[PDB]
User: Which sequence fits this backbone?
């Protein structure tokens, strides 16, 4: 009852087994990613298992979307019904329009939390990934060291709890 | 000096004496088998499996992984080093795949090295035996230097098509096979060129340049459709599995097999050309080699996955259809080549018999595995609609 | 009718013209750089010639291993400490070679010039060969060595310990996650040019000193393939030297690449060399200074100066934190010995004299601690003492850098003692230096690696070992050990009886 | 025990220190080149030369020998172990010969092994690719099985013709080359059977038994004179040089080349047979390798010998005339096979042109080298009389 | 349409049908035997598969030599005495291998059944392989060893000494001169089966014990080929058993072959082993008894009894003349040290004890002789003394057996003290035993080998050494030496001081 097999993991497997609706599952996934993934998760209560849980959910959503979509849709339509190419091209716009790294950062992370497959099709996802990431980096690596650590900590909004340097 | 200045623990009396004194009376564990915890695909565990399975550090959140936790460093944005997000296919274990030929780096470069060495000896024998004399000048200067040559860019394209997979494959066993599949493909492209380079040395005016064969590829009409299919498989697909599957269990199986076997491998002889066949022999040996791996991954492993069998077949059936059309098209445009062949070279009775072979083999080895019910007559009919 | 043939060079001449232009003909990975489509590669190789030259090497290597070396019982007549050391060196390097496969694949996908792609491709296959070679070393020592445990299951047993986390950072994730060019600098511009290349030769040197003729037979063979990987890294810089983004981003990704790599290898390699052997080859500080400063930071980086490349700004900081790093790290490695997949030994008298002689002040710090632990019975299973207890008793917390995963103990270290602790959106983060802290601040989402204390929190030590298979064949005796002798090996039970439960050290600040 | 019972001087502390203590400070001679006294054929002495030249313990009374005195034990009657009396040819030094390919044992079996493993890889790809499907049934069952099959006995007979030379050759370099020329011939005979054996596996009803091909060889007409020539070269010739020279510089150079290259390799393709050409490529590579050696020994060394040039050419001319007649007879009867082919396969002009190619190559590569006066139209005219 | 191929056995099944009938299809060599027309072979091989299995062995062998062994400097770390032993052992064996090439060529011609021809054919190629392997050992020791002289030119410097003559009898002319079957007995039924196969293994043991890892790497590879050669010699017996003539001649040819081989290898091998080594493995006497008596005379020969084969009638004498034979010979070998292509050493104190212990009475005879020669300064260049001189002063003539070429001193030898001197048609002939004498009496024309005394008569020692290139690359220092130390090496001039002139010992008889 620990690292690979534990009560909390078993609990979620039975929670995904009761999912029998692309809609309901596609929703629980989106909500799961908002609650437990990326530095902006709603809480770190599942930090040791969310990665494994999230995938066990992607599987349920993947199977359904396949038995619920059609040739053309499974390839161009998200599990939410959205039109893949639409979102991709849209998100890239906001990014290329982003004012600074702080703005870019949020859009990219956000893009992943909502459209990570089985939601968006793999082909469009990774294509954005190459475009979004490219912009995020360009803004971030520009004058990477100019901002002193004291200030950077403020920009990030972190709560400093302890510091020691002889 | 004769003895050197560096003392070695295995032979230096002083140092070895100390080492021998530190040794335990017997091995501290009787289990001398590396990879003993791996599930053997065959009778006993093979060297191939021991040296390959689990080399990839995937955690349990990637079907099959034995590690735990997230990656240490990720992409700006949060994209994982490797993740379930890079391919539609799902499985109970990505390390289930097994190359039927059990090829790890050593056996692989050993086999290819033998071929390289023999190839050399052969070319030196061909040139010395004057076997070039019985070779038709037209075929030599037009069908081998233009149409065969241009086909190299087709293979080259399929080669590059493996780049993303080499980076994204979700397991060692799958990554090694992919790498080999793509590496053999560029080998062929370089062999197609090697011949033109050889002909250049034995035929006075023959130009080895790729200018002519490239133009035929870039702007020609014979391959035009084929090239479009390549560009799509290579630069439009971001799913490593879709790319590998569509390329090996669809495109190359239909278009590739025809162009290589049912065209040059079946006609080059008729023009007193045993040279080109020497190389197609390799490409076909390779093809058949890659096929066993492609079969074991997408069918034995994914297609018959104890958990996502139906799901995968659905996706592969989907992919099959998605690319079956551009493949059919690629063929159609190719048919326009027979018209450039001297009269009597071949007729429609043959072309039909050959096509049905490629298609029947395709259906026998790939299609029926994922239940992609196909119409042999319609397909042949569709492609055949490209004749003069 | 004179005998004629065609060689690689003659076919390679037209390789560049293999790629053709068209709309979507571009890399599929995010990058800030633009690699030139006219870039050339140094070695004019084709698939077949590549295979031949590599096959010729395999023949020699495997021939020595299966014949003369086996007949000489080379797998056994190796010092115990070194047999253990190779469990880590070979398997750790194996994963580095393995992710290099994916890295060069990503690189192959990046290059637009046919020759540049071909070069990376040659490495793709090389890394595959190196993965299998390193695997063969463990395979061989398992089959014929004095202790197979670890050599035989490192691919899973390495997941228990903390030193493995840092390895994945510099030789797995650092190699493939992020801007392709950044990954290249980590792999070829720094890792290989500054560490791996010199390292592999060094390893063979320490191996021979300790009776290990197997590793030299394999590693020296890997070494012959390095000149080609050096060229790729050099060509990566060349292919972007004309791009405007280079002068604006290169030096940044490079410094970050430098710090990332040295952060781990500076302490880890020195530790493996000096603490994992009986006979020494050379003091690690002398080696490090030569490798990092002269060869790399000087000669290697110097040649790239004409392409905008400059010395990592974090260089002076590295040399500062370096001196005692490996010594500081072994203390933690030994204290946490039950979490490894290898057996550790404490310095013997000759070694303590050697350490003090080359590191004045070593005995009064490290020397005394080890003699204290040994007198208390850290080697004897019936003492009920694991050095981690000594750290707890004397309130000396061990933390894991959220970025590099390197374990550090600020209150005891003789080297760096800075500690930065932050909280952000409900999670605490511990950092060991100013560079790693910045990387996390600017890229929070790139570094969320859970540490051993977080995952093992609340768990009793023996439960973790057993769960992760840290046992030898008899299902009772531990793979890991606090000594390298044949008798009095610790068992799962000897560990359970202590009732040690992991705690997350960062919670003390709450 | 983990360490074993036997102690080794190289690793055992006690024994090695005893070894090390007795060692001189440096080598007792700085000349570390074995065979340094051998006269190099090329720029620098080769591993091939060092390991081979003078291995044969010949005394000075057999041209080029470095030993002295009679043999220790001779045959009843007095015949010498090796002696000048075993061949008509004379030279200033029997050790001058050099295989241009510099083949000593290791390189020889290495290359043959590569060919073997690749062959196996080729066949598995050939059967898996189903290429047998397009092969003409008549060519397959009649010409490959019976006629190509009967030729194995020809190659086998030539292999056997080398048995006495293996025993009588007057130098190591000549003995090694002869052995390899002979070994390559039995290999070809075996590859001919291997193909028949392969066909028996992928072709229902194909009988791999040698009964038919053998009956064709022993009692047919097509190969009658060929068999009579082989029986003679092998068993009526006791001179090891007459045997080798006549086999390679006359019979196989004309008949052999015609059958392998101008009949089977030239026509097989026209019947959808890429299988037989695969093995013939091997035979022709072997032939060209042997030729280099045959030319060095008989033309470069013996035919151009500074003291016995005229004499040797007279003798080789004598031999060419002696074996040219039976060789023409063998070609003449072989012409009969053309009548057995399906109408329209080839015509009299093609046959004639192909004979001229074989006769012209022979003139340039062999006949002209010893000033043998060959009338090409006369050779061809005599052979053509065999056309039905 | 399933992947299929064909293997060796599948083709071999029809190989027996390859041969066909015709009036002149018969052996070109004289013989009293008729090899059965339908005899079969043990291994179903074809050229391709033969090449493959040999190539695989070569990879390991050369792999070990070029890599690990070279890196271990194994060519040097061998006892001086043994480096010298291998000059004779390897080059002499080389000729046996070489003549075995011609020998099996002759057998393949004798054989009428395609399968028996193919068995011999496979040996013809193995013999070429073995010739090149033996050459390689001398080649490797010359390139990397402590003393290349001799190793680098044995093919011509071997002709100076008397020991070479006997070698060409048992391993050259004995392999190819006479009835093909007789030659088969000398080579296979006796040579390999009784001496070389057990010999090859023995050499690897002695070699390993003296620091030589080169010879085991090569000779152990050679040994794996001897399985097929044993089957050849065995089928030779089977292919003639059902022939009326076999009952009349087989046992007589076998007896002569046995004596031939034994007469030379008994004293020579034991000499090379016990006096050519520092570290001993086993006393030659017990080694011999096992090989000749147990393993061969009983086990091997007994199996062939069914075919009419009987135990050698001269076996009793061979044993009687064995015990001291090798000791008798080393006295002559050292006495004539200036005629070799290797350096010899007097037995040291530790060795003399070993000899006395294992051969009681060894000291009172040989021990004292060596001690005297030492006192006379046989080791020192300025002494002006050479052991031969001692034989002249004490009227101890050295004769050469007209048949076996084995040198012997009947008045001093502890073994056979027999001597038979005959005059025939103006020539004198000296024999050392009743078997060799019968051979000559019945077959005068088969044994006309002129001996060194006959060829060197009236010649000054230094002139002969110089003429036959018995010098080192400096053009003055002799290749052969009376000691194995690194200094005080005799020169050609030290031998010309001496002014020793050869004389034919048989000329004294009236
Ligand atoms: O021998 C050793 C094995 C592992 C470490 Br970590 C250190 C030393
Ligand atoms: O080492 C030795 C070399 C030759 C003889 Br003979 C004896 C011993
Ligand atoms: Fe590498
Ligand atoms: Fe590398
Ligand atoms: Fe042999
Ligand atoms: Fe043998």
Assistant:
């Amino acid at each position: 009852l620990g690292i690979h097999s534990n009560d909390t993991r078993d609990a979620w497997v039975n929670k995904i087994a009761q999912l029998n609706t692309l809609e309901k599952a596609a929703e629980m996934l989106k909500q799961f990613r908002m609650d437990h993934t990326t530095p902006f998760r709603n809480s770190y209560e599942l930090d040791n298992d969310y990665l494994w849980i999230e995938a066990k959910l992607e599987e349920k959503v993947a199977v359904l979307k396949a038995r619920a979509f059609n040739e053309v849709d499974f390839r161009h339509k998200t599990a939410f019904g959205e039109d893949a190419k639409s979102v991709l091209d849209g998100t890239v716009a906001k990014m290329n329009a982003a004012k600074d790294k702080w703005e870019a950062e949020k859009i990219h992370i956000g893009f992943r939390q909502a459209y990570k497959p089985p939601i968006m099709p793999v082909n469009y996802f990774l294509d954005g990934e190459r475009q979004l990431g490219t912009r995020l980096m360009e803004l971030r690596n520009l004058n990477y060291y100019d901002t002193p650590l004291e200030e950077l900590r403020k920009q990030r909004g972190v709560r400093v709890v302890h510091l020691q340097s002889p | 000096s004769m003895l050197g200045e560096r003392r070695r623990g295995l032979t230096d009396p002083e140092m070895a004496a100390v080492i021998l004194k530190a040794l335990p009376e017997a091995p501290l564990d009787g289990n001398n088998k590396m990879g003993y915890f791996v599930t053997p695909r065959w009778k006993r565990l093979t060297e191939y499996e021991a040296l390959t399975v689990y080399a990839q550090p995937n955690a349990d959140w990637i079907a099959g992984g034995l590690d735990w936790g997230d990656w240490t460093q990720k992409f700006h944005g949060g994209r994982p080093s490797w993740g379930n997000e890079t391919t539609e296919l799902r499985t109970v274990d990505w390390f289930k795949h097994r190359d039927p030929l059990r090829r790890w780096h050593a056996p692989y470069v050993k086999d290819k090295a033998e071929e390289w060495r023999y190839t050399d000896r052969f070319l030196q024998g061909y040139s010395a035996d004057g076997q070039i004399r019985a070779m038709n000048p037209t075929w030599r200067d037009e069908f081998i230097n233009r149409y065969w040559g241009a086909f190299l860019f087709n293979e080259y394209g399929l080669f590059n098509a493996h780049s993303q997979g080499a980076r994204e494959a979700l397991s060692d066993v799958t990554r090694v096979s992919l790498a080999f599949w793509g590496f053999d493909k560029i080998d062929i492209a370089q062999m197609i060129q090697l011949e033109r380079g050889f002909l250049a040395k034995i035929v006075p005016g023959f130009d080895e340049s790729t200018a002519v064969p490239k133009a035929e590829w870039t702007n020609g009409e014979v391959y035009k459709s084929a090239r479009l299919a390549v560009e799509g498989l290579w630069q439009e697909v971001f799913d490593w599995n879709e790319s590998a599957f569509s390329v090996h269990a669809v495109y190359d199986a239909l278009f590739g097999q025809f162009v290589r076997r049912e065209f040059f491998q079946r006609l080059a002889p008729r023009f007193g050309d045993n040279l080109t066949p020497f190389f197609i022999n390799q490409a076909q040996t390779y093809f058949q080699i890659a096929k066993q791996g492609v079969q074991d991954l997408y069918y034995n492993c994914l297609g018959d996955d104890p958990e996502f069998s139906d799901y995968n077949r659905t996706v592969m059936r989907n992919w099959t259809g998605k690319w079956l059309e551009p493949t059919i098209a690629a063929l159609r445009d190719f048919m326009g080549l027979f018209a450039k062949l001297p009269a009597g070279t071949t007729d429609k009775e043959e072309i039909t018999a050959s096509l049905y072979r490629v298609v029947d083999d395709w259906i026998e080895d790939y299609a029926s595995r994922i239940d992609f019910k196909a119409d042999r007559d319609q397909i042949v009919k569709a492609v055949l609609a490209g004749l003069k | 009718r004179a005998p004629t043939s065609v060689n690689a060079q003659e076919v390679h001449r037209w390789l560049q013209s293999f790629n053709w232009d068209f709309k979507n003909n571009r890399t599929k990975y995010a990058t800030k750089y633009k690699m030139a489509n006219e870039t050339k590669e140094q070695f004019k190789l084709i698939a077949k010639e590549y295979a031949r030259m590599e096959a010729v090497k395999d023949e020699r290597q495997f021939g020595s291993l299966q014949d003369a070396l086996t007949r000489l019982n080379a797998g056994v007549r190796v010092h115990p400490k070194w047999n253990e050391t190779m469990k880590v060196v070979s398997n750790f390097l194996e994963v580095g070679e393995y992710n290099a496969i994916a890295a060069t694949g990503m690189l192959w996908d990046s290059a637009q010039a046919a020759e540049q792609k071909n070069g990376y491709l040659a490495q793709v296959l090389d890394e595959i060969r190196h993965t299998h070679q390193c695997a063969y070393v463990n395979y061989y020592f398992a089959k014929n060595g004095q202790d197979p445990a670890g050599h035989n299951d490192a691919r899973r047993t390495r997941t228990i310990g903390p030193l493995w986390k840092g390895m994945k950072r510099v030789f797995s994730d650092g190699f493939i996650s992020g801007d392709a060019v950044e990954c290249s600098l980590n792999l070829q511009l720094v890792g290989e040019a500054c560490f791996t290349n010199p390292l592999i030769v060094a390893v063979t040197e320490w191996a021979a000193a300790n009776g290990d003729e197997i590793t030299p037979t394999v590693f020296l063979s890997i070494e012959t393939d390095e000149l080609r990987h050096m060229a790729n890294g050099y060509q990566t810089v060349v292919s972007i030297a004309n791009d405007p983004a280079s002068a604006k981003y290169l030096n940044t990704d490079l410094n970050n690449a430098f710090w990332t790599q040295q952060k781990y290898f500076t302490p880890v390699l020195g530790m493996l060399f000096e603490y994992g052997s009986k006979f020494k080859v050379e003091p690690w500080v002398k080696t490090w200074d030569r490798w990092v400063y002269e060869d790399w930071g000087g000669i290697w980086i110097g040649r790239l100066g004409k392409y905008g490349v400059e010395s990592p700004r974090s260089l002076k900081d590295a040399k500062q934190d370096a001196y005692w790093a490996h010594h500081d790290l072994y203390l933690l490695a030994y204290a946490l010995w039950p979490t490894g997949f290898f057996r550790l030994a404490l310095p013997d008298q000759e070694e303590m004299e050697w350490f003090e002689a080359n590191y004045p002040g070593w005995y009064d710090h490290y020397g005394k601690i080890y003699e204290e632990w040994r007198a208390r019975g850290c080697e004897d299973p019936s003492s009920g003492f694991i050095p981690l207890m000594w750290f707890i008793e004397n309130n000396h917390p061990i933390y894991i850098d959220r970025v590099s995963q390197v374990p550090f103990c600020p209150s005891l270290a003789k080297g760096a003692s800075t500690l930065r602790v932050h909280e952000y959106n409900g999670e605490m983060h511990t950092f060991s230096d100013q560079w790693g802290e910045r990387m996390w601040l600017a890229e929070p989402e790139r570094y969320e690696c859970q540490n051993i204390f977080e995952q093992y929190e609340g768990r009793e030590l023996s439960e973790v070992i057993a769960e992760l298979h840290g046992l030898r064949s008899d299902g009772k005796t531990l793979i890991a050990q606090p000594h390298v002798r044949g008798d009095k090996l610790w068992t799962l039970d000897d560990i359970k009886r202590l009732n040690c439960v992991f705690k997350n050290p960062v919670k003390a600040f709450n």
Remarks:
- The CA atoms of residues 2 and 173 of chain B lie 47 Å apart.
- Residues E 97, 100, 126-127, 130 surround fe (iii) ion (ligand 5) (CB under 6 Å).
- Chain B has one domain: 1-388.
- The radius of gyration of chain B is 25 Å.
